[PDB]
Amino acid sequence: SMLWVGVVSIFPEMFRAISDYGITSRAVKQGLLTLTCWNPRVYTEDRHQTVDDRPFGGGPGMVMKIKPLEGALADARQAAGGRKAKVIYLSPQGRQLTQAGVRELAEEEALILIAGRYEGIDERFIEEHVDEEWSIGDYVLSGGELPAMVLVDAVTRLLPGALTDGLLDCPHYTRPEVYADKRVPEVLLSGNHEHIRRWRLQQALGRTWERRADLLDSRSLSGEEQKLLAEYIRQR
Amino acid sequence: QSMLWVGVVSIFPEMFRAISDYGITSRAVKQGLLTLTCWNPRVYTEDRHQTVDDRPFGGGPGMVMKIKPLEGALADARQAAGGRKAKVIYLSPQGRQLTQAGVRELAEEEALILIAGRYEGIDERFIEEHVDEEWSIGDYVLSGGELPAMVLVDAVTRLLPGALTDGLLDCPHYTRPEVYADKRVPEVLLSGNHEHIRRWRLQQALGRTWERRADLLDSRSLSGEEQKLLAEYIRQRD
Numbered sequence A: 001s002m003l004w005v006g007v008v009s010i011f012p013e014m015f016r017a018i019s020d021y022g023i024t025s026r027a028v029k030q031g032l033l034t035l036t037c038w039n040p041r042v043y044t045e046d047r048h049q050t051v052d053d054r055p056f057g058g059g060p061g062m063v064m065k066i067k068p069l070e071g072a073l074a075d076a077r078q079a080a081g082g083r084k085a086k087v088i089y090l091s092p093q094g095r096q097l098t099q100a101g102v103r104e105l106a107e108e109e110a111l112i113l114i115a116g117r118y119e120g121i122d123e124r125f126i127e128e129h130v131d132e133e134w135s136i137g138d139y140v141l142s143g144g145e146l147p148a149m150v151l152v153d154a155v156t157r158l159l160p161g162a163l164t165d166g167l168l169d170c171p172h173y174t175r176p177e178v179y180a181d182k183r184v185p186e187v188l189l190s191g192n193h194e195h196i197r198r199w200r201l202q203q204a205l206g207r208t209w210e211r212r213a214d215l216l217d218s219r220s221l222s223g224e225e226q227k228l229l230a231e232y233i234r235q236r
Numbered sequence B: 001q002s003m004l005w006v007g008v009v010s011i012f013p014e015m016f017r018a019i020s021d022y023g024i025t026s027r028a029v030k031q032g033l034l035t036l037t038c039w040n041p042r043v044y045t046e047d048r049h050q051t052v053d054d055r056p057f058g059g060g061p062g063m064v065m066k067i068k069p070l071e072g073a074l075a076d077a078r079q080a081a082g083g084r085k086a087k088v089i090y091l092s093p094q095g096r097q098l099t100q101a102g103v104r105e106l107a108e109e110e111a112l113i114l115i116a117g118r119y120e121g122i123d124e125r126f127i128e129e130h131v132d133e134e135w136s137i138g139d140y141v142l143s144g145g146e147l148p149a150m151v152l153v154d155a156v157t158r159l160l161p162g163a164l165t166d167g168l169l170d171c172p173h174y175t176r177p178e179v180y181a182d183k184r185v186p187e188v189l190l191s192g193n194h195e196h197i198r199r200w201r202l203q204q205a206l207g208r209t210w211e212r213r214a215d216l217l218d219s220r221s222l223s224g225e226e227q228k229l230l231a232e233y234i235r236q237r238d
């Protein structure tokens, strides 16, 4: 198994969305990717022992207790075997996920994802056990299970046999050639690899320029790209 | 009746149990605050194998989603939306990056129809004809728009009245025991003074934001009371 993922969450059954459907589901079946869950609720001491507890200094909500989390993590570590396991906390405070970050995480042999809820986990747990913190975007969600599934989905795509340049994609077209008085660009219907690849490159450069110009400030444009972009802008 | 109507067009309707059965979104459905419907384009297919994807024009790898199944599912969902002003969103990597400002805009809507593509994407003419807005959840590639659609619903649901102001990272959280493996909870929290704990939390929130996401402070104007606490934090740190 290329990659081994352990998810630490109080809602293990939410993760059926990725284990039972899509490319992630396929990866589990193909033996390419191992996906396990570790509910911290079961690593408490008794039954009156809640996974969470009230926050110090008052305030609303609950905070996740260090001990259950430590139990779930130690267990997942053990199950990972001799694999080099990176521990990620899914957090709004984390480094924004980008395809570059996904490529970095894809190089890992084992990943242990911590998905906490709205009133978060105890700081000492993070300080002691977490390696990296990641956010999926600058918007507020009510927990880290959807961001954990987003991370697992993005990474799985890069696993060999499961299936970018800093540019948006070109438009896609499929049958019929004419639909509701709209025709597929002739270059795609009638054209050689060099026409199509230059057209695709120009549409990709053009759409990026139009919608996400910031992705161009970071990137340096080639001779062909600058020409194809100028040509696109002037032929709008 | 309900505050928000949401129709999702996806080939995996059963992936949406993650939001219909859990958290605040699950609650909103039960509270009648939010309606959640799915529309599988696979039901709007002719053949006995239910194919929603066709080959891409101009060659290339992968498959593209056929206009007709999508059109069927969208027409059906637009009917079910009734007389509600329905905004049609395509969940796409090419779309407008979702941010809390975006979420607030999207929360003002009475009805939302979300298109969750699969494969290499959907036909451009479908987008041109039927889609109102395109949204992305981040600069990374996923294999479908389902997770992005659930992220969008969750973020938006949080803003629905009765489902539950800053724009900065959270302060640290601490819970029992007061001491764990030679690490103690900051005295200020253990103390119990209302005003003191409040100022400490605000300062830690301002401080952590400054340290990790300074950009969130540039397109932000801090009050005098926060301007002092942040300066105090900066100079009182190793």
Ligand SMILES: CCCCCCCCNCc1ccc(CNC(=O)c2csc3nc[nH]c(=O)c23)cc1
Pocket: A090, A091, A092, A116, A117, A118, A119, A120, A134, A135, A136, A137, A138, A139, A140, A141, A142, A143, A144, A147, B166, B167, B168, B169, B170, B171, B201, B202, B205
């Ligand atoms: C009195 C000082 C309080 C400081 C105020 C700042 C509070 C803002 N953060 C609260 C919060 C913490 C955790 C969540 C749950 N979110 C995630 O666990 C999460 C995990 S990854 C992620 N990526 C994008 N968005 C996300 O919400 C997340 C939601 C809101």
Ligand SMILES: CCCCCCCCNCc1ccc(CNC(=O)c2csc3nc[nH]c(=O)c23)cc1
Pocket: A099, A164, A166, A167, A168, A169, B091, B092, B093, B094, B117, B118, B119, B120, B121, B135, B136, B137, B138, B139, B140, B141, B142, B143, B144, B145, B148
């Ligand atoms: C840094 C952005 C680069 C974008 C260019 C990557 C090429 C994307 N086109 C192919 C493709 C289309 C749709 C998908 C499935 N994903 C989504 O529909 C999706 C919908 S919203 C979203 N947000 C971030 N990432 C995403 O992949 C998505 C996967 C590959």
